[PDB]
Design a binder for these strands. Sequence first.
DNA 1: CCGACAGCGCATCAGC
DNA 2: GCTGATGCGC
DNA 3: GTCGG
Length: 324
Amino acid sequence: TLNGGITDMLTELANFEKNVSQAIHKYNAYRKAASVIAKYPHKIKSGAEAKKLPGVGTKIAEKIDEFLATGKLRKLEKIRQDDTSSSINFLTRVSGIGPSAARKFVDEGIKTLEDLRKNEDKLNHHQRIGLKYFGDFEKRIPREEMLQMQDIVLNEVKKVDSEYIATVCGSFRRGAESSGDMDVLLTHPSFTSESTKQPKLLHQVVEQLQKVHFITDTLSKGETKFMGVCQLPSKNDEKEYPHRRIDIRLQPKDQYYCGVLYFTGSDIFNKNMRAHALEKGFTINEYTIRPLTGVAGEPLPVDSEKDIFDYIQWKYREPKDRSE
DNA sequence: CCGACAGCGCATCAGC
DNA sequence: GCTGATGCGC
DNA sequence: GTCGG
Ligand SMILES: [Cl-]
Ligand code: NA
Ligand code: NA
């Protein structure tokens, strides 16, 4: 990356404000600035140059000036030497443990990986599985593996019901060569926004993927959202694949486009698009787009992803151009 | 200067 | 058990 | 922390 040193600094600051300071808006602010800087096709020479970018203000510009001049940030150096901040930042790396639980664990003396591995009875089910695959969940997923995972999911899904349609979204759909997880969008004609003609639609698919030993664990599971763990099958005498995070989302068939837009991402892209929608007088979720007194109106007709872009007056962006 | 910052499903808890 | 507020991840 | 009213 051209400005990897700068974006890493802002990303580290973002993680600090979220996990330690618990300031979610500062967290989003740093990420937004890091994102727009990452896409900047020039090697930044000064904070003043960066300040021209939307999302970069005075304070970050000062930090950029310090980093370019010294190669480091004194603010981050002090944070790294803070034991409380270090313990919290580590504990939050476990899936299921947020800023509140992390700080609570530190008060109770639980602040290391070794402490967690002898205090599993103090964790909820989500946190326990997150600890179980602490290392694997921080591993990236090669696209080659994502293809194998996709092939398994789609085929096992077909065997349950041919009317099922499974679409792999996330960074994979954006054509990335590596993904953080697998986010599957599932639709079935019996499940629309109007009615649910068949129960256990999500359960059947999860069951099947568990039968073929693809899904190994379950973080959380409901009627429309599944969060769990999956693993590719390895060959004889071969080292096992790392366990992977997989999300399966049952979406209303008639609301596929709003759904596929959200689950495609990226996260920063979604936040920017939804924020821009509000300025245009619209509100967007993974189901519909509505005009917005502040009271949301009736859903607008959507026959493509592009229609959502057209409403908020944006030139259409292919999934590959939504990786911010 | 200063209000608003995207939006939601599942797990968990407390008040009744 | 129902309702609503929180934490959490995305 | 940054932006728009
Ligand atoms: Cl809606
Ligand atoms: Na700016
Ligand atoms: Na966490």
